[PDB]
Symmetry: C3
Subunit: 328 residues, 3 copies
């Protein structure tokens, strides 16, 4: 088979690809380095992060149904623990976790057949309590396996996107000291027992897109223009989310994320099950600012689950118009 070496890019962007496969099955070669590091989630809050390739979420991989995926996974000697990878896209050996456990100073190569079309979570899952802990420390991403002939709507008709954005949502459990200030540690292990107590409450201290509060706002805002059909691929490896595009809709939504299932239409809010990725297409109709949020608004605003989309184009008063401006 032909082998294609890909260069991953940081989320929310995606490496170069084509929606409709240009070839018959290929072996897609990917490489990722595991990076443990403290990251700043908010002005007053830090996480002892464990990442694929230095980003939360890990980068998006895009392949086609029937392709193979060959991952070189490296755990550099400066990391402090073993890691592995479980692809929900894959069949067998706990998604690949049972064949990819590597100590710092080791690498491994896993191949699997992308037999099923859909956006899928991949995440670290080293065993026992390590499993949730690695995941809630940021060790999860997504692979999108597109049908070879691209996406189809509820009627089996072609649908093409102009832009794909990968929104990784992650819940985190940062402990606080007696003074109510978030705690900081030398490394992940020193913070573990304090983090476990917060985990056991099941209440996140933070719920973020692209690894930090406000990551996808300001300079990081998503960009589009009126007329663009945009695919929003949204992962949540540990906890449910309820995405909503404020001022928009889900034109075609695969909330369970698997492309051979008929999508729903016209959704106001959809549902991402913890442990999964979903996808929604919207064609922008109005210019302006949009917020993409988890529509538990406390999670959106207090916990950090808000992104912005900035949309260029011309306003359509037939869709919406302020007939009388605020007046006494």
């Amino acid at each position: 088979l032909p082998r294609v070496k890909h260069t991953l890019v940081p989320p929310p962007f995606a490496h170069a690809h084509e929606q409709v496969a240009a070839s018959g099955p290929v072996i897609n070669e990917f490489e990722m380095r595991i990076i443990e590091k403290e990251v700043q989630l908010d002005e007053d809050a830090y996480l002892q992060a464990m990442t694929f390739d230095g980003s939360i979420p890990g980068p998006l991989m895009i392949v086609h149904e029937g392709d193979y995926v060959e991952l070189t996974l490296i755990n550099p000697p400066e990391n402090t623990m073993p890691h592995n990878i479980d692809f929900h896209a894959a069949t067998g050996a706990l998604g690949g976790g049972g064949l990819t456990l590597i100590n710092p100073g080791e690498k491994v190569v896993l191949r699997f057949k992308a037999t099923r079309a859909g956006a899928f979570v991949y995440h670290c899952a080293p065993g026992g309590p390590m499993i949730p802990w690695h995941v809630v420390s940021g060790m999860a991403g997504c692979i999108m396996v597109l049908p070879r002939d691209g996406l189809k709507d509820h009627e089996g008709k072609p649908v093409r996107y102009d832009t794909v954005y990968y929104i990784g949502e992650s819940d985190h459990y940062i402990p606080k000291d007696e003074d109510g200030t978030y705690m900081r540690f030398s490394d992940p292990s020193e913070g573990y027992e304090d983090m476990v107590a917060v985990m056991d409450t099941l209440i996140p201290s933070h719920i973020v897109f692209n690894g930090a509060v406000g990551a996808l706002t300001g300079e990081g805002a998503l960009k589009a223009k009126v007329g663009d059909n945009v695919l929003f691929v949204h992962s949540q490896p540990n906890r449910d989310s309820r995405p909503h595009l404020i001022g928009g809709h889900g034109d075609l939504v695969w909330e369970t994320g698997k492309f051979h299932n008929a999508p729903e239409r016209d959704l106001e809010t959809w549902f991402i099950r913890g442990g999964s990725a979903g996808a929604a297409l919207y064609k922008f109709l109005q210019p302006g600012v949009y917020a993409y949020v988890n529509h538990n608004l406390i999670e959106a605003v207090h916990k950090g689950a808000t992104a912005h989309v900035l949309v260029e184009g011309e306003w359509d008063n037939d869709l919406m118009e302020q007939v009388v401006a605020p007046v006494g």
Copy 2:
């Protein structure tokens, strides 16, 4: 276009309408007044409420797909803060929020095209932390945009309801003093910081239908008779719910609430995503008392998410019969 002025009625009832549109597109004129006021949620518990039209939820609006909606929104001078409105039914300007921000002593008129069929949440969303706070203080309702030719089942066949009820479910976060008694305040602002702490736990103190524990029980129980096809439109603007009609089913369920998607059948329990409205039709077969509940039973019973339906008619022993009464 023809203009139709509607008189809203308090939930769970709905203003006069016809399921199948009597006309081609019309401009539907609605007016609502914002009312801030303390409301009693339970025997020992009060909320500093912010409401559309003095009710939690705000009243149901019913229009048809392709109609326009023209809302006059008034913030009377006796209120203490700015408010706006975001219709999930609408396209652009954050659902209308970006064009409807009004100070006390102001009004605004917004028009939008109801381009998509479904039950949709509308809610206040003034910006930043104001967003969840206004919503969890009760500032949310629903608009139902029916297909011009009325509802259709999974086979595209006409389905007609005899009665519609709008069940608005709302989560609230009432703080407690050191003695464990729920706190009361002079106004919403005086209660804000205490309420924020409860919000951050993500645990509601109360989860209610129609604005109070027991609101839809006793005198407020819903009414039907055997043979009635009843549409239950159920909103939850901030948090998930899992409705269940005890002793019944969802005959046709649009849990994501959008009428051009095929409904599921025969559901025991369905799922309303926080930030959305869903709808379920049931044709009553047995007389008696039914409870309509959020089927997290702790939320149903301890938090307040229980309504009753009282159904007239004749019992059918073929469906169910007590063959042997309780005996030693």
Copy 3:
């Protein structure tokens, strides 16, 4: 009508049955005894349990659509409270709860027509605060009503399972003393007020399959072989779950659990609404160990929602292969 007396077996197994009905409608006779008893959930944790037939979950009943179900329910004199049963499968009288309330030292016989195909929760629901309390003390099971002609896929084609397993997931709220140790009581009533406080937080202390942490692991692991099509019927009577078969998929998934609705395909993770049962079929392709988990991984690992499946057969390197073993 012909009468068929069934002998229930403890979960996760199912009493003898045939997927395709061998007959026209029959009256299915079942008997269950209510057993109150302390059960051990984990090494350090006990529950004051209330059970159908001495198991959490209660045993699986299997019938066909259009059959009748006739339950003899016995509350032996050694129990301390009244109990009843609500079948979500049934129509009228709060699912049968209104006709089955029995004191210790009493029995009752309820008949209902299994008019709707699907997996359905049954649970005790004696009234008011008793409702959630009985349920979270373990008093819930499942009845599966199969279409008379067996299961059909998304295209209406026959699908046959080789094995069915009933996974009952239950949330529990065990209180802790000042020393942080889980409390133990003489009986359910002595533990009630302490348990209520934990319930009101909505945070389970434990979330288990088959009634205990690790119940479906070790000796209790589920068994299959490559090529087996296995139906996983999964109930959760009070709280949502998000099942995932690690290293596998849901080939055909009815997450809302009702067999006349088209199933989704290729799911990584699916969603069981609290108050419902869902079902997923998977045909095993790789041998080895699988974990079946609630994919909130904190719930899976810290709270107890993990089961194992041990699968015999031959490994297929085309699906997955470790191309390079861990190396420096």
